[PDB]
Paper text:
In pseudocyclic proteins, such as TIM barrels, β barrels, and some helical transmembrane channels, a single subunit is repeated in a cyclic pattern, giving rise to a central cavity that can serve as a pocket for ligand binding or enzymatic activity. Biophysical data for 38 structurally diverse pseudocyclic designs produced in Escherichia coli are consistent with the design models, and the three crystal structures we were able to obtain are very close to the designed structures.
Central pockets in the designs are shown as gray spheres (a–c). In d and e, the oxygen, nitrogen, and carbon are colored in red, blue, and magenta, respectively; hydrogen bond networks are shown as yellow dashed lines, and water molecules as red spheres. The approach generates a wide variety of structures strongly encoded by their amino acid sequences (as evaluated with RF and AF2, and further indicated by the close agreement between the crystal structures and design models), with between 2 and 7 repeat units (N), repeat lengths of 15 to 78 (L), and all ɑ-, ɑ/β-, and all β-folds.
Residue numbers in the entry: 1 to 127
Amino acid sequence: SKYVVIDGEGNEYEFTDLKEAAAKAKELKKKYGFASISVPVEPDEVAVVDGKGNEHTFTDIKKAVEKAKELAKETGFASISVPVEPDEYLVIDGKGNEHKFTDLKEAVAKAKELKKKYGFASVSVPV
């Protein structure tokens, strides 16, 4: 598999191991303010990755968002991953709304604004 961490500069870090990826994301967030992690998700699923590097899969985005809030507090980190098409980037905010981009730095900039507004936002990238 391939797991991708995105930081606040729009840099992409690739990993073969989820626990190492989730640990990098948690560190970039604590040290530099922002990080998302994208993981392979089955079609019609959504996945939340927590601060322990564990996945939580869902078919209902509203339930995923609810869980992502429990996990960010309990484990120190949470990121929602959704399937994206090549050359697209999707931002999911803390209320479950999806915003589509074709420029990663644009997607990151929006995610930062939505994190301020709603408390939480993730950026999903193609795997």
